[PDB]
Structure formats: structure tokens, C-alpha cells
Amino acid sequence: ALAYTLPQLPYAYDALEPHIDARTMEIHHTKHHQTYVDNANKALEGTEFADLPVEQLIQQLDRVPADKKGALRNNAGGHANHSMFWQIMGQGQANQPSGELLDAINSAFGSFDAFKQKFEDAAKTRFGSGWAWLVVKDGKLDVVSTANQDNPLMGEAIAGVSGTPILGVDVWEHAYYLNYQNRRPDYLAAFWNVVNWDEVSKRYAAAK
């Protein structure tokens, strides 16, 4: 009766090549994400929180037992973040959104190109491990970043920022070191080639 399972990827391990290497995809998924799933399930065992979806759980960290707060923040956080991450990438995806998402990007950031710059800048200036995010907050889009496995859905007091993510990029060095080593900006440039903007559009619609 374990709470979470490792999701299947929506594509093969080499589907994102050369932008993201196959070996990275496999380790990232089968070692790193799996560890977050396993440690989250351990932390949830003696609780009333094992039946909640992970995205609801991370919105309730203040309510869980005090001794399990850190472990769930880190591991439920890791699980939520990676689960989204696999889904917002895809193969055979210049790659950009359309329709209402693009309209929201133009009004929030000026243009898709200016949005990409702001997103990259957030991801670049994230010192240490973390994520950069495109969030819906008060019906409007913004770019924020978080430390480690914090997610904007955890709220401002915990994560330092708020909002409902519809896109994120993992800037933990494990996400890019085998292919780009220290060159995080090259990783980030490459990332735009794999974003599934149909998926991000669905998430935008879901988040308002």
C-alpha cells in the first residue's frame, strides 16, 4: 500500500538526444526520481497523508508531523517536480507555444523571446541546486526559482515563492553534468528544443 510509484516516461531514454543524453535520462529517472519516491513513501507510512496526490501533499507540509516535514518537503517535492519534468519534455518538438498560452506569455513578459530570457536568467542565477519555473499566480504568468526540491506549490513561507507551475527546468547538476559539465547555459539553450508546449498549454488551461 505504498503512496507513490515511479511514473513511466512518455518517450524512450534516447528520445531527447542530443539535447539531453540517454544515460542522463535513465539515471535521472531510475536512480534520482526513484530515490525521491522511495524516501517519500517511507516518510508517509505512519501518517494520514499517504492517500493524497503528491501535488496536494506538498501544499500541506505545515500540517504533517513535525519530524516528517523536512523529508516530505525534499522527497515529495522531488517526486512532484520530476513527475512534471518528464511530461513537459518531448521529442520532435523553432519550438514555441501558440494560442492562449502564447497570449498570456506576450502579456506577462512582452514576447516568447523575452520570456525565454527571463526563464534562462532565473535558472542561471539559481545558485546551487534548484529549479526555475513558469507559474500561474492570480491568473497571471510569472518566472520564479526555488532551491533544491522546493516547488512554488509549497507556498512563499517554505519555498520563497508561490504559484502553480506549468513548466520547470531542473538545474541540479545531475540534470546536465554528463552532457554539459559546468556549461549550464548550454543546457538551458538545449532545453528549449525539448519542451512539449502542447503539454504546457494543457497545464495552463488546468491552472486557469
150 lies in the site for Mn ion, by CB under 5 A: no
Single-letter amino acid, residue 91: Q
Q: Please tell me the total number of residues recorded for the chain in this structure.
A: 208
Select from 35-43, 62-70, 96-104, 169-177 the region that touches Mn ion (CB under 5 A): 169-177
Give the nearest distance from C-beta 74 to Mn ion in angstroms: 12
Q: Which is nearer to Mn ion, 38 or 108 (CB)?
A: 38
Give the nearest distance from C-beta 113 to Mn ion in angstroms: 27
170 lies in the site for Mn ion, by CB under 5 A: yes
Q: Which is nearer to Mn ion, 31 or 183 (CB)?
A: 31
Give the nearest distance from C-beta 78 to Mn ion in angstroms: 7
Q: How many binding residues for Mn ion (CB under 5 A)?
A: 3
- Nearest CA-CA partner of 23 in 189, 194, 183, 177: 177
- Nearest CA-CA partner of 153 in 72, 61, 86: 61
- Nearest CA-CA partner of 73 in 175, 189, 179, 158: 158
- Ligand-binding annotation for 29, yes or no, is no
- Ligand-binding annotation for 174, yes or no, is yes
- In 66-190, the DSSP E strands lie at 130-137, 140-147, 164-170
Select from 14-22, 96-104, 118-126, 162-170 the region that touches Mn ion (CB under 5 A): 162-170
- Ligand-binding annotation for 28, yes or no, is yes
172 lies in the site for Mn ion, by CB under 5 A: yes
Which secondary-structure segment (H or E) carries 113?
helix 112-125
C-alpha cell at 112: 516568447
Give the nearest distance from C-beta 18 to Mn ion in angstroms: 19
- Ligand-binding annotation for 79, yes or no, is no
Q: Which is nearer to Mn ion, 1 or 182 (CB)?
A: 182
C-alpha cell at 65: 508531523
Residue closest to Mn ion (Cβ): 170
C-alpha cell at 84: 512534471
Collapse the DSSP code of 135 into the 3-class scheme (helix H, G, I; strand E, B; otherwise coil) and give the result: strand
Q: Which is nearer to Mn ion, 131 or 192 (CB)?
A: 131
CA distances from 147 to 42, 87, 154, 197, 205 (A): 23, 21, 12, 25, 27
Q: Which residues would be at the binding site for Mn ion (CB under 5 A)?
A: 170, 172, 175
Q: Cite the annotated binding site for Mn(2+) by residue number.
A: 28, 82, 170, 174
